[PDB]
Design a protein around this ligand. Structure first.
Ligand code: NI
Ligand code: NI
Ligand code: NI
Length: 192
């Protein structure tokens, strides 16, 4: 049974509440959403979906509340299974946000920018290294590591009700904004 153990964002490793750290950061707001929306899985309880998304669903459910309700005000418009999905932003219904997850390194390659304390900054060398190092620690704990990114689709070219072509990409899947990593562990010993 999977459970999110750690995560990397705002350039810092975080412990997942086994009972994230500071939720204040808007970066955590986005990661949380990417982990809840780019996720097919419903009901640490009885799952229905693959292991990883099961854990994510549990993590976000406990850390942020009803993901059921999160998925409700962020209508799925398109989807693929990396894994991605586009939604009508709760923020402003008129625009869309592309949420994607998958292999850390492959994910990283599709990102030009990255969020640090809510601020989007180019994903230069320094940051790529911060990522490699993080990716090394978490993977080194024998945990399954996932990468999370998103992209606020321009409302001009992708207005509300734009027919996204899931097969033949009718949109961009490159130059996304890296948000964070989330590592999960395959077992437990006791509960607190
Ligand atoms: Ni730890
Ligand atoms: Ni153990
Ligand atoms: Ni203990």
């Amino acid at each position: 049974m999977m459970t999110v153990a750690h995560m990397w964002f705002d350039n810092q490793i975080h412990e997942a509440d086994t009972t994230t750290f500071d939720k204040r950061s808007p970066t955590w707001t986005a990661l949380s959403r990417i982990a809840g929306l780019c996720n097919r899985a419903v009901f640490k309880r009885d799952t229905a979906g693959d292991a990883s998304e099961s854990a994510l669903l549990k993590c976000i459910e406990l850390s942020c509340g009803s993901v059921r309700k999160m998925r409700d005000r962020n209508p799925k418009v398109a989807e693929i299974s990396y894994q991605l999905s586009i939604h009508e932003r709760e923020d402003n219904p008129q625009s869309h946000v592309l949420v994607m997850k998958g292999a850390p390194e492959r994910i990283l390659d599709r990102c030009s920018s990255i969020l640090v304390q809510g601020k989007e900054i180019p994903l230069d060398k320094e940051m790529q290294d911060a990522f490699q190092n993080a990716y090394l620690e978490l993977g080194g704990l024998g945990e399954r590591v996932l990468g999370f990114c998103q992209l606020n689709l321009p409302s001009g070219k992708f207005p509300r009700g734009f027919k996204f072509d899931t097969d033949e990409l009718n949109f961009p899947t490159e130059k996304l904004c890296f948000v964070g990593l989330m590592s999960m562990i395959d077992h437990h010993h006791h509960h607190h």
